[PDB]
Every structure is written in structure tokens, then in C-alpha cells.
Design a binder for these strands. Structure first.
Ligand SMILES: *[C@@H]1O[C@H](CO)[C@@H](O[C@@H]2O[C@H](CO)[C@@H](O[C@@H]3O[C@H](CO[C@H]4O[C@H](CO)[C@@H](O)[C@H](O[C@H]5O[C@H](CO)[C@@H](O)[C@H](O)[C@@H]5O[C@H]5O[C@H](CO)[C@@H](O)[C@H](O)[C@@H]5O)[C@@H]4O)[C@@H](O)[C@H](O[C@H]4O[C@H](CO)[C@@H](O)[C@H](O)[C@@H]4O)[C@@H]3O)[C@H](O)[C@H]2NC(C)=O)[C@H](O)[C@H]1NC(C)=O
Ligand SMILES: *[C@@H]1O[C@H](CO)[C@@H](O[C@@H]2O[C@H](CO)[C@@H](O[C@@H]3O[C@H](CO)[C@@H](O)[C@H](O[C@H]4O[C@H](CO)[C@@H](O)[C@H](O)[C@@H]4O)[C@@H]3O)[C@H](O)[C@H]2NC(C)=O)[C@H](O)[C@H]1NC(C)=O
Ligand SMILES: [Ca+2]
Ligand SMILES: [Ca+2]
Ligand SMILES: [Cl-]
Ligand SMILES: [K+]
Ligand code: NA
Ligand SMILES: [Zn+2]
Ligand SMILES: [Zn+2]
Length: 786
DNA sequence: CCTGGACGGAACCAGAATACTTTTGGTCTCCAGG
């Protein structure tokens, strides 16, 4: 690079040495970049004595009479010198259409992202943050926005830009080892600048591909905030054929002060006031350009902040005798791998056993990554280590003390940290959208940050790249430019078999001593791939029975608020009955379950909830049976016998849809073409990796689930089908003490279940479709309200 | 008031050497001295 050139007339140019706002991070600036592009003289504010000054090229910004036409006024110039008001002192006025100067072809978007802005900081209100609080109350806001896991900065910022889970965009932590590159990504170092780390298609690329020009989305750490704002405002003054339409501002605060003082320290007020001042400089500057009723502004955080101190550290050396032979990414999560990459003597089975339920109130839990809760979507990337530690909120994990023998000093230089499970309340962050395209004075329910990329594409007129948002689920944020979603097309249609076989046709080794109106409430699920399946009706339930898997894809039934739970008679404990509607060759068989000494079986519709002794015999049909480990039947039985009825009594009836999931390669997608790796011994009955249930009722619970007029209410889960209950440290006790807690950990979205099964639910309701897409992205988190 | 040392491996930051990732001292406050 020839740094002998000059940045004269090129400062922060958007197209030899460089003068853009990343040259410093690459060490490519022309020698006079600092002198010409980072002026600082006289600060960032006009004063009464500067009004009408003779222009002086040394000043950071100008208060001369010409600064308006040259677009380089201080952001407060009009207020101090021409009698105008600060944007924050003006009334809220609805913006029904964009009010943009001639030559603007579309409303610009400015993304204002803050680091470590916990959702509950908004409770400080206008006394601390008057500009932000006016954006929030005049625009559209969520009470919180859910980040992705791990709740660290780089995974979340790049999720914001791409709409992808970290396992898909590839930035799975702030530091990473990639065994194929054999290289390490680190915030310190040049390797992170290599494009091979960064997957997906971020918004600035989507924009350029479709004719929408982008400003920078990265800012060099040494460029002060006021200068970033003034640069964006100067870009917005460029001619129509050079001006960008999408911009990004980033602040590292208030993350650093949160680390030092903690989220509840009175010291948090000052960094929040400082951010608010920068927001006020932007809004005043836009008002000075006559763009304050033309630009869409998004104020968004990457994650929250939790109380974490030195008194709450677990050390792996208290569990493992050789912590020198492993590498640990520590803190609010744990990722473990061998010190020597691909070391053949690395034994994660011995490691995980020593880390499982070893101390009474142990403040982390180990997982092989395929056993993490599916809602984290944190497994399908070679940069994610197989061995993972989920750390309890407010705690850290560390590798080992330096000197195990030294005394208690009581010195701690930090009080906050982030990185925990993304459903923890302290990790939630902020979302505000203000402008012509967002709604006016509107509160919307919490939503996940993977959904934002689609919205930003809608605000710019862009077709999104394939991503993990559900396009249309945030239409209720927008006054216009909504996306019109359409139902996925159904690929397979069901057969409806009648009675076709005799009992005597079956040699399964088994022994035994208004259906749609009632049990399928929202239409049958569509099967979105080619397959042969049967729909089977019974008094108490309906099912879609797969000929390939030899079991239901789904089973649907409605349990009313007054339903009765009954016992299985002792003479029917082991009853299994051939189904005369379904061929012997497309049935499971009981011999395979006897021969398999690890596998038992359960039922998708529970016999416990049968409507009469006669109807109960339907529950023992071989077409209702599914393979289950004995340890898992403890969970599933408690769900069926205890929890379904409880939910029915609390929600005024429930509709339940349950079924198997196969995801042996842990990519979150229904698996296909020989990816299933386990079968019941000697048979072609595949073994599920998970079981799901979707539990729906009326949002207005004064109406019974089967007679619901308005919006629906849903909760769901994806339970891992494990041969032991090692995940639950007190599973040796009665199920009342651990099963429900386990289920809450594995809560899921209906959407997560659609990916994993290839089914599409809620196809026949009386609701608009965009409302159903919102319902399908809902996650019941079991957390108190923020 | 001044200097040095410890803090403790967990947070962030910004100096080095281990050499652009990895590792360490500092942070604030107290202790020891002059
Ligand atoms: C969340 O949303 C994302 C985006 O839609 C979904 O991920 C997509 O999933 C599909 C289905 O598996 C993948 O399709 C397959 O694509 C490959 C070609 O892949 C290359 O080209 C695409 C298109 O440009 C790139 O996006 C891919 O990028 C991956 O690799 C680069 C370089 O290695 C890396 O930097 C990226 O981060 C990214 O890695 C991630 O994806 C891969 C899987 O591709 C995964 O292994 C990794 O760990 C990360 O997760 C890539 O450069 C194509 O060969 C395949 O063909 C197969 O299917 C066809 C039928 O379609 C068969 O006929 C054929 O014989 C093959 O068997 C697939 O089409 C797609 O790559 C992937 N996209 C991304 C960006 O990840 C997720 O599934 C969604 N998650 C959930 C839970 O819904
Ligand atoms: C998983 O955890 C197990 C159990 O902690 C662990 O096995 C233990 O490893 C240590 C280290 O090898 C063993 O060694 C100890 O070290 C001394 C000498 O240096 C031995 O004399 C000790 O025997 C004493 O044991 C008593 C314990 O207090 C002493 O008080 C007594 O005086 C004995 O002399 C002791 O052996 C330790 O023995 C094992 N324990 C068992 C049950 O094996 C294992 O290494 C861990 N695995 C992994 C992968 O980390
Ligand atoms: Ca799969
Ligand atoms: Ca040290
Ligand atoms: Cl990380
Ligand atoms: K068995
Ligand atoms: Na257990
Ligand atoms: Zn962050
Ligand atoms: Zn942080």
C-alpha cells in the first residue's frame, strides 16, 4: 500500500491508499487521514459566539452561514443559531407517509445498535434517556427482543445482519477454532478479517445486489461517536446518484460499564445519558436535513447483562484431574476440546461423567452438543465443540485457580457479564422502530432477533436471502410494505383406509386379553414432502400414519376441562392390538421390542385419557405405538397422565398434537435418505431422537378450546429421547420433582417442530395468516414478566 | 504527599512474547515502607 497519497477531497469516500472508515483497522490510510478526516478542533457543538463565524477548515464541524448548503454543520447549528427546537422538545406527530426531499427514491434506514443494552434499562425512562424514550413511545416497540445463543456480541450482531442462527452464519462465538482451516478466530488479531469465516448474505450485500446503496456497517474503534454521526449525516447530503439508502451506527456502550458496575449499579445512569445524547445528535441532525419524517430508525441491542461476580465461579479442576490436557472457552458458557487438535487420547465420555451431577448445587450442566435444547439451534457447525457447558445465570466457569493455596482477598474488578441461555430474562435486549414505515405509538409482543433481517429487507424493498426468520411473522410492526405470505404447498395427500384385513392375517407376536370435528381443530397438518401415509380416525383421537416409518407422523386429540383421567386395567398393561385398516407389512411388531433389551414402547394418544372403557382399546392399537426407552417413558407417562389434564383444567381444554422427530445429524431439519442411524433390534422400525407436542387453546380462556372464536394460545416442546435421565440430577426421585422442570428447558416454537418434521400446522383457522405465523414463532419461556 | 506490590485467571483492556494468538498485569484499594 502506497500511503504517500492524500485523503484530500476523499474523506470517508464510499468507493493506492484508503480513506474509508476501516482503513485504520487494516493500516491502509493515507498519511494525512488523521489530519484531514478526523478533525476535532472546537468540539462538536455550535455556541452562540460561533454563529455566523467565518468558516475555518480546522474545525470538527461548522457554524458558518454556508454550512447548511455544504452539509457540514454541527448537529445543533439550527437550534443555537436559527431559533429551532431540539427534536426531543417537539410533539410526537404521526408520520402517515414518508416526507422526503425530491430525489429520495425510498425512505433511508438507519440502524442504531447498542452493545449490552438490557431490556429492563428502558424502565429508567425520559428522566435518563429522553431522546430514546420518545423514539420508544412514539414509534413501535417490543417489551424486549430475544437474542441468539450464545448471548455474546459477534454472534448476535452478525445474526442481526443475516437473519441466520450462528450455526448457519458461522460466527458461533467471539473466539473459535476451525479444525478444517486449522486456524483460530479472535477479536485480537487479523484472522477475523478473512472472509472465509463469515457466511450467509448480510444486509449490505443483499442491498447492493438489488440496487440499494449501503454505507459502512463497521466503525473503526478510534473514530469518535460524534464523528460517526456526522459522517452519516454528510453521506445523506450526497447527490441522488451517490447517496446510500441504508446506514449503521454502532456503540460499544453500555456494555463496558455493565461489566464494571453491574446492571443495577447507580453508575449505569451516566453511560445511558451519553448514548441518549448521541441519539439526540442524530435526530437533531436529521431534522436539520429535513429528513426526520423520512428516515426509518431502528434502535436495537445485541444482548443484555447479568449480575456476575468473583464469588460465583466454578473451577473444572474440582471435577477433572487433568485440566491441562484440555482447552476451555470459559465464563458464562463452556466449550471444551483437547489441547492438541484431533488428539486421539481425548475421551469426552470420561470427562462428561466427571462433570455430571457431582456437587449438590452444581452451577453448570454438561452436554454433548447434539443434546442441547433444540431451541438454541447450536450444534450444526464444525466450529462448535462437541462438549458444551450450559452455565447457570449469575455464575462463571473457569479452568483452574492459579494458586489453589492462596488466601481470600475479596478483590473483584467486575460485576456484570452476559453469554447465558437466551431465554434468561437478564439476557433480553431492546427493539424500537421509528419512522414512516413503522406503526405509530404501538407496542408489539417480544420477538427473536433472527426475524429482523426480513423486516429490514421489507423496509428497503429487498427480497431477503434464505434465512431463519419466518417472513410475515412481524407484519404487525409495519404500517405498509408488508410481505404477503402464502401457505406452503402440500406435496402428499392422505389415504383414508377402511377395514381391509382379518385379525388372522397378523403375525406380529402381539397379545391382548365427529372425530375430525372434535380432535383435529385447525385442519390436518400438511405433509410437505412425497410419502405414503394413512389418516386413521378413532373416538378419542386422529392420526396420520406413515408407511415408511411404521408409526404416526402426528396424532391429534382434544381434552376438555372436565375430562377424566383413568387407570390402565392390570389385565391390559401389555395389550397391543393389530389395526385391521393397515397391512401387516406396514405394522410394527411386538417380537422386535422383546428382543431389543434397551427399547420399550409407548403410545402417542394416552390410554389414561380414553373417554370410556370400550374406547380405551383403541389406544392399544399397534398404529398408536412408538419406540421409547424406559427412562424416557418416565417423562412421557408423567406428561400424559398428569400434565395434559392439568393444562386442560388451567386453559379450559387443550388440543394436543404429538409425534416423533428424527434428527440424527442435528441440523434441525427432518432427516432424509438414510440419515436415520438407529432401529429397534432386528427390525426396520426407526428410533426417534426427540418427541414433540404442540398444546393449543383459546387466548380467551373463558371459551373452551374446541369452541374458540378469536386468537389462539400455544405452548410446545421438543423432548430429547434419551436412554437415561442423566440430564436431571434428581431423577431418582418421584417425577413430581423433576419432569416438569425438564420439559420447560426443552420448550420450543411450533416453527422449530415444522423444520424437524416437514409438517405445516394451523392450515384451517379463522385468523389472518400473518397472525398464525406470529403464533408459530412464539416461544413459551416460563420466565416472569420483565 | 511519594514508590512498590498484590489483586487473579473468571470481566475488559492493552502491553509484551509465546509472536497477530496467547498470555499477563492492571483495574481499586489496601498494605508495606520512606
Ligand atoms: C436456517 O437458514 C439457513 C439458510 O436457508 C438454512 O441453511 C441452509 O440449509 C440448506 C439445506 O441443508 C443448505 O443447502 C445445501 O446447500 C449446499 C451448498 O452449500 C453452499 O452454498 C450455499 C448457497 O450459496 C451456501 O450458503 C453454503 O454456505 C455454507 O458453507 C460456507 C462455506 O463452507 C460457510 O461459510 C457457511 O457458514 C455455510 O455453512 C453452513 O451451512 C452448511 C450446509 O451447507 C453447514 O454444513 C455449516 O456447518 C453451516 O451450517 C455453502 O457454501 C448444497 O450442496 C446442498 O445440496 C444438497 O441438497 C440438494 C437438494 O437441495 C441435493 O440434491 C444434493 O445432492 C445435496 O445433498 C443443499 O442445497 C444451505 O447451504 C444452508 N445455508 C446456509 C447459509 O447455512 C438452515 O437449514 C436453517 N436452519 C433451520 C433449522 O431451519
Ligand atoms: C474423575 O474423578 C475421579 C474421582 O475424583 C478421578 O479419580 C481420582 O484421581 C486422583 C488423581 O489421579 C487420584 O489420586 C489421589 O492422589 C494421591 C497421591 O498423589 C493418592 O495417594 C491418593 O490416594 C488417597 O485418596 C484419599 C483421598 O483423600 C487420600 O486422603 C488417602 O490418603 C489416599 O492415600 C489419591 O489417590 C484418586 O485416587 C482418584 N480417585 C478414584 C476414586 O479413582 C479421575 O481421575 C477423574 N477423571 C478425569 C478424567 O478427570
Ligand atoms: Ca436432520
Ligand atoms: Ca498474574
Ligand atoms: Cl465465545
Ligand atoms: K424391550
Ligand atoms: Na438423573
Ligand atoms: Zn455485545
Ligand atoms: Zn460484554
Amino acid at each position: 500500500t502506497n500511503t504517500s497519497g492524500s485523503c484530500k477531497g476523499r474523506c470517508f469516500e464510499l468507493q493506492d491508499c484508503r480513506c474509508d472508515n476501516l482503513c485504520k483497522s487494516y493500516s491502509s490510510c493515507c498519511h494525512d487521514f488523521d489530519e484531514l478526516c478526523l478533525k476535532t478542533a472546537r468540539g462538536w457543538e455550535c455556541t452562540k459566539d460561533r454563529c455566523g463565524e467565518v468558516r475555518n477548515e480546522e474545525n470538527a464541524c461548522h457554524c458558518s452561514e454556508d454550512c447548511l448548503s455544504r452539509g457540514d454543520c454541527c448537529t445543533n447549528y439550527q437550534v443555537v443559531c436559527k431559533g429551532e427546537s431540539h427534536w426531543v422538545d417537539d410533539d410526537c406527530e404521526e408520520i402517515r407517509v414518508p416526507e422526503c426531499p425530491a430525489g429520495f427514491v425510498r425512505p433511508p434506514l438507519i440502524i442504531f445498535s447498542v452493545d449490552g443494552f438490557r431490556a429492563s434499562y428502558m424502565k429508567k425512562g425520559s428522566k435518563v434517556m429522553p431522546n430514546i424514550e420518545k423514539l420508544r413511545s412514539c414509534g413501535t416497540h417490543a417489551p424486549y427482543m430475544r437474542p441468539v445463543y450464545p448471548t455474546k456480541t459477534f454472534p448476535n450482531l452478525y445474526t442481526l445482519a443475516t437473519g441466520l442462527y450462528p450455526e448457519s452464519h458461522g460466527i458461533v462465538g467471539n473466539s473459535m477454532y476451525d479444525p478444517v482451516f486449522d486456524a483460530t478466530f479472535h477479536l485480537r488479531g487479523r484472522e477475523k478479517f478473512n472472509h472465509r469465516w463469515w457466511g450467509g448474505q448480510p444486509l449490505w450485500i443483499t442491498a447492493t445486489k438489488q440496487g440499494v446503496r449501503a454505507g459502512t456497517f463497521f466503525w473503526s474503534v478510534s473514530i469518535p461517536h460524534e464523528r460517526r454521526i456526522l459522517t452519516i449525516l454528510q453521506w445523506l447530503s450526497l447527490p441522488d446518484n451517490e447517496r446510500p439508502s441504508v446506514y449503521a451506527f454502532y456503540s460499544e456502550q453500555p456494555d463496558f460499564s455493565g461489566h464494571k458496575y453491574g446492571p443495577f449499579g447507580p453508575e449505569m445512569t451516566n453511560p445511558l445519558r451519553e448514548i441518549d445524547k448521541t441519539v439526540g445528535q442524530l435526530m437533531d441532525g436529521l431534522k436539520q436535513l429535513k429528513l426526520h419524517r423520512c428516515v426509518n430508525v431502528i434502535f436495537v441491542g445485541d444482548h443484555g447483562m447479568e449480575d456476575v461476580t468473583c464469588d460465583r465461579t466454578e473451577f473444572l479442576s474440582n471435577y477433572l484431574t487433568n485440566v491441562d490436557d484440555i482447552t476451555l472457552v470459559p465464563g458464562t458458557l463452556g466449550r471444551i476440546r483437547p489441547k492438541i487438535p484431533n488428539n486421539l487420547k481425548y475421551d469426552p465420555k470420561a470427562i462428561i461423567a466427571n462433570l455430571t451431577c457431582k456437587k449438590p448445587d452444581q452451577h453448570f450442566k454438561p452436554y454433548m452438543k447434539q443434546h442441547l435444547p433444540k431451541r438454541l439451534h447450536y450444534a450444526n457447525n464444525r466450529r462448535i465443540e462437541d462438549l458444551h457447558l450450559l452455565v447457570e445465570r449469575r455464575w462463571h466457569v473457569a479452568r483452574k485457580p492459579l494458586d489453589v493455596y492462596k488466601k481470600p482477598s475479596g478483590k473483584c474488578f467486575f460485576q456484570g457479564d452476559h453469554g447465558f441461555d437466551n431465554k434468561v430474562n437478564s439476557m433480553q435486549t431492546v427493539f424500537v422502530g421509528y419512522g414512516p414505515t413503522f406503526k405509530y405509538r404501538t407496542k408489539v409482543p417480544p420477538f427473536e432477533n433472527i426475524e429482523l433481517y426480513n423486516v429490514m429487507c421489507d423496509l428497503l424493498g429487498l427480497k431477503p436471502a434464505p434465512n431463519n426468520g419466518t417472513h410475515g411473522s412481524l407484519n404487525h410492526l409495519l404500517r405498509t410494505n408488508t410481505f404477503r405470505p402464502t401457505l406452503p404447498e402440500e406435496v402428499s395427500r392422505p389415504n383414508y383406509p377402511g377395514i381391509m384385513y382379518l385379525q388372522s392375517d397378523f403375525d406380529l407376536g402381539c397379545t391382548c386379553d365427529s372425530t375430525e370435528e372434535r380432535h383435529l381443530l385447525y385442519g390436518r397438518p400438511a405433509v410437505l414432502y412425497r410419502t405414503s401415509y394413512d389418516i386413521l380416525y378413532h373416538t378419542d383421537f386422529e392420526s396420520g400414519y406413515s408407511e415408511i416409518f411404521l408409526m404416526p407422523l402426528w396424532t391429534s386429540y382434544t381434552i376438555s376441562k372436565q375430562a377424566e383421567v383413568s387407570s390402565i386395567p392390570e389385565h391390559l398393561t401389555n395389550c397391543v392390538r393389530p389395526d385391521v385398516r393397515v397391512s401387516p407389512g406396514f405394522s410394527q411388531n411386538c417380537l422386535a421390542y422383546k428382543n431389543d433389551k434397551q427399547m420399550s414402547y409407548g403410545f402417542l394418544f394416552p390410554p389414561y385419557l380414553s373417554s370410556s372403557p370400550e374406547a380405551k382399546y383403541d389406544a392399544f392399537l399397534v398404529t398408536n405405538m412408538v419406540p421409547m426407552y424406559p427412562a424416557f417413558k418416565r417423562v412421557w407417562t408423567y406428561f400424559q397422565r398428569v400434565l395434559v389434564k392439568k393444562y386442560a383444567s388451567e386453559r379450559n381444554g387443550v388440543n394436543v398434537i404429538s409425534g416423533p422427530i428424527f434428527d440424527y445429524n442435528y441440523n434441525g431439519l427432518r432427516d432424509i435418505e438414510d440419515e436415520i442411524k438407529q432401529y429397534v433390534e432386528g427390525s426396520s422400525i426407526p428410533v426417534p431422537t426427540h418427541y414433540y407436542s404442540i398444546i393449543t387453546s383459546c387466548l380467551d380462556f373463558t371459551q373452551p378450546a374446541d369452541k374458540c372464536d378469536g386468537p389462539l394460545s400455544v405452548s410446545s416442546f421438543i423432548l430429547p429421547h434419551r436412554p437415561d435421565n442423566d440430564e436431571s440430577c434428581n431423577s431418582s426421585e418421584d417425577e413430581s420433582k423433576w419432569v416438569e422442570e425438564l420439559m420447560k428447558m426443552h420448550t420450543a416454537r411450533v416453527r422449530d417442530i415444522e423444520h424437524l418434521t416437514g409438517l405445516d400446522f394451523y392450515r384451517k383457522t379463522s385468523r389472518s395468516y400473518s397472525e398464525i405465523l406470529t403464533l408459530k414463532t412464539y416461544l413459551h419461556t416460563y420466565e416472569s414478566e420483565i
